[PDB]
Amino acid sequence: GSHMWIGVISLFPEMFKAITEFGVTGRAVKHNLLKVECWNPRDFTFDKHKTVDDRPYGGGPGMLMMVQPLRDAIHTAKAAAGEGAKVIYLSPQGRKLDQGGVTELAQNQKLILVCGRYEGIDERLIQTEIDEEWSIGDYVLTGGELPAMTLIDAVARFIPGVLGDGLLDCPHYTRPEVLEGLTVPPVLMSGHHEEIRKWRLKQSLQRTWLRRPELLEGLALTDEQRKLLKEAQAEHNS
Amino acid sequence: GSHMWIGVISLFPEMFKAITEFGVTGRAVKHNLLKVECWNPRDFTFDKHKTVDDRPYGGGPGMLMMVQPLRDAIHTAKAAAGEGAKVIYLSPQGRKLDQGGVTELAQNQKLILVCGRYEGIDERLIQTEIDEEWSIGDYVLTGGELPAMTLIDAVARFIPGVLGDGLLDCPHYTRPEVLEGLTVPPVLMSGHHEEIRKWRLKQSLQRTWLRRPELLEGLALTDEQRKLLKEAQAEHNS
Ligand SMILES: Nc1nonc1C(=O)N1CCN(Cc2ccccn2)CC1
Ligand SMILES: Nc1nonc1C(=O)N1CCN(Cc2ccccn2)CC1
Numbered sequence: 146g147s148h149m150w151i152g153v154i155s156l157f158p159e160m161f162k163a164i165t166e167f168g169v170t171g172r173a174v175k176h177n178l179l180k181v182e183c184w185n186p187r188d189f190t191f192d193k194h195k196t197v198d199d200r201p202y203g204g205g206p207g208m209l210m211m212v213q214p215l216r217d218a219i220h221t222a223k224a225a226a227g228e229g230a231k232v233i234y235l236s237p238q239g240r241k242l243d244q245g246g247v248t249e250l251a252q253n254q255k256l257i258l259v260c261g262r263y264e265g266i267d268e269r270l271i272q273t274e275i276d277e278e279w280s281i282g283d284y285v286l287t288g289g290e291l292p293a294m295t296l297i298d299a300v301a302r303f304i305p306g307v308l309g310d311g312l313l314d315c316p317h318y319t320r321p322e323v324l325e326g327l328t329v330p331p332v333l334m335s336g337h338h339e340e341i342r343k344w345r346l347k348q349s350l351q352r353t354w355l356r357r358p359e360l361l362e363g364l365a366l367t368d369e370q371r372k373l374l375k376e377a378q379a380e381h382n383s
Numbered sequence: 384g385s386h387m388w389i390g391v392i393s394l395f396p397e398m399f400k401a402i403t404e405f406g407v408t409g410r411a412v413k414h415n416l417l418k419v420e421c422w423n424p425r426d427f428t429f430d431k432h433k434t435v436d437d438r439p440y441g442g443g444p445g446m447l448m449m450v451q452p453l454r455d456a457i458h459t460a461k462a463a464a465g466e467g468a469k470v471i472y473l474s475p476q477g478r479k480l481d482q483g484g485v486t487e488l489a490q491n492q493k494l495i496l497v498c499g500r501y502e503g504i505d506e507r508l509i510q511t512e513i514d515e516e517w518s519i520g521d522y523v524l525t526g527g528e529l530p531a532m533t534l535i536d537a538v539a540r541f542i543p544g545v546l547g548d549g550l551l552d553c554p555h556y557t558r559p560e561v562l563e564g565l566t567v568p569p570v571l572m573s574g575h576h577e578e579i580r581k582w583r584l585k586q587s588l589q590r591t592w593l594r595r596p597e598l599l600e601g602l603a604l605t606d607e608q609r610k611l612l613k614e615a616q617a618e619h620n621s
Contacts, residue, residue: 157405163398163532168500169525199557203571203579209557238551238590243521262406268554269565282520283481283598286536287407294401295533298524313476316506319437319447327507333441341441352476360521 146305150180151297152222152230152257154215156197158183160290170298173307181297184222186214198263207264215259215266219274222257230255232276235292236265237285239278242296246279250296251303258296260289311364313357315348343373351377384543388418389535390460390468390495392453394435396421398528408536411545419535422460424452436501445502453497453504457512460495468493470514473530474503475523477516480534484517488534489541496534498527549602551595553586581611589615 153161164170165181173179187195190211197215198208223230231253240246250256259266259275271278281292301307318329332344350373353360366374391399402408403419411417425433428449435453436446461468469491478484488494497504497513509516519530539545556567570582588611591598604612 160401160405163401163528167395167398168528202556202558202567203583204576209555212557212559212562236552238594244523247522264555265552266555267557267562269556269562272565273563281533284485284537285482285540286533287540290401290406291529291533291536295519295524295529298529299522302523302525314474314503317445317447317502317504318440318507319450319505321450324450324505324507325511327510329440338442345441356476 146178147254148178148180149251149253149300149304150182150226150230150255152226152255153181153183153260153293154186154218154222154257155183155260155290155293156186156262157260157288157290158185161294164294164297169307170301173301173304176306178304178306179297179301182222182225184218186210186218189214189217189221201264205264209264210262210266212267212270216270216274219257219259219270226255226257229253230257232257232259232274233296234259234261234266234271234275234278235281235289235296236261236278237280237283239280241283242279242281242299244299247296247299248303250279251300256300258289258293260293262288311360312349312353313360315345315352343369346370347373347377350374351381354378355381384416385492386416386418387489387491387538387542388420388464388468388493390464390493391419391421391498391531392424392456392460392495393421393498393528393531394424394500395498395526395528396423399532402532402535407545408539411539411542414544416542416544417535417539420460420463422456424448424456427452427455427459439502443502447502448500448504450505450508454508454512457495457497457508464493464495467491468495470495470497470512471534472497472499472504472509472513472516473519473527473534474499474516475518475521477518479521480517480519480537482537485534485537486541488517489538494538496527496531498531500526549598550587550591551598553583553590581607584608585611585615588612589619592616593619 161181161183165174186197190196197211199211201209281295318333322329332340350370399419399421403412424435428434435449437449439447519533556571560567570578588608
């Protein structure tokens with residue numbers, strides 16, 4: 146349907162088996178809802194030792210990805226993708242990913258994700274080959290592979306067939322009715338669908354307010370949400 | 384040395400091969416700097432079909448992880464860990480992970496990471512078994528495995544032997560000297576180490592200011608940084 150094709154450039158393509166062979170994303174791939182295709186810069190090297198890193202001009206302790214194998218891998222992925230593929234570099238210097246950002250990226254039918262290693266890629270490749278730079282969070286990882294897999298997983302949820310409001314989630318409960326002395330809220334046992342809905346929404350508003358108050362600032366709360374939030378705050382203040 | 388032990392509770396333990404078998408984290412594991420040990424709730428089931436999900440009280444479209452197999456897996460991981468292990472649940476309702484948070488978690492010698500699937504785990508298990516809840520970002524994934532692997536990768540960088548200031552990174556350049564008409568900044572070719580240092584720091588300040596101005600607010604800039612930032616801003620304003 147709205148199937149998605151994601152090309153990946155990575156020195157460790159076998160890492161992506163974690164999403165292509167298991168769980169929800171694994172099923173998406175099996176059912177041809179998601180296609181993930183990997184190119185390894187190591188395969189585009191020509192020297193005997195298949196060199197994929199290179200020294201930075203200006204010195205320093207680190208290395209960068211070697212330009213020629215990486216550039217050639219990217220070009221190969223672009224040729225396979227055809228027209229309309231957006232090329233993404235994952236790094237801490239990119240636009241911070243959130244769910245709105247995920248929904249934006251998910252509108253793309255084709256993505257190419259470039260996974261950096263070492264101290265990253267040549268700035269001129271970012272200028273000449275990368276459409277958008279994104280970060281999955283303000284922390285530093287050993288490479289772009291986990292970020293790429295995280296992005297793939299998040300956007301995959303928006304492909305129709307893959308799955309079976311700005312607020313944090315409400316608490317959920319399952320069997321048994323009592324667990325180390327802790328009981329399930331009686332409302333959830335009541336069978337009263339409307340009370341249960343309002344209880345869940347109220348809990349969500351309360352948890353967002355207590356844990357992530359700044360998320361509430363970004364919202365235009367509905368009349369019902371304003372009411373339930375006021376109630377939750379009143380109860381919190383006893 | 385400051386080796387780290389990380390217990391993992393996951394319905395898809397084979398996903399963690401992406402970090403235990405490859406790259407920097409793979410080497411950490413091989414060199415016994417990092418130990419990652421997985422328990423699968425499916426192995427703690429007793430029914431013929433090894434059931435690991437259960438219906439939420441109060442209804443709704445989703446499922447939760449079944450309490451008994453998950454609880455038993457967690458208890459088993461805690462027994463293996465001995466004393467001092469901090470138990471973490473990964474979810475969008477948790478404390479937002481950043482590099483400071485990574486450095487905090489990395490001070491722990493033992494971690495147990497609980498990977499949720501479905502609509503997550505019973506709220507009472509969070510109360511009774513989880514020490515801390517963390518989020519790797521404000522977006523929704525299909526399960527806690529990629530978040531757990533991301534956390535493991537980030538904290539692993541702080542284990543001594545694993546690897547070979549609040550600002551975004553400077554641009555980096557490697558061979559060739561000219562790439563699609565784009566040249567390497569002459570300062571990086573100059574061999575003047577102090578000019579190169581100041582240029583890199585200035586670029587870092589400029590990029591942070593242009594891309595992530597709010598990160599600058601959280602910093603107490605050094606005298607040198609204040610100067611170079613003013614210069615970068617002056618040049619930006621031509
Ligand atoms: N945070 C993140 N959100 O996406 N990716 C990351 C992330 O930490 N990494 C690890 C280091 N990389 C290689 C690198 C190093 C320095 C500059 C540019 N590239 C990028 C991928
Ligand atoms: N963002 C994140 N940072 O850490 N983990 C995530 C994340 O998206 N997920 C996927 C859904 N999970 C299962 C679940 C669903 C609802 C409530 C609680 N648990 C948690 C793991």
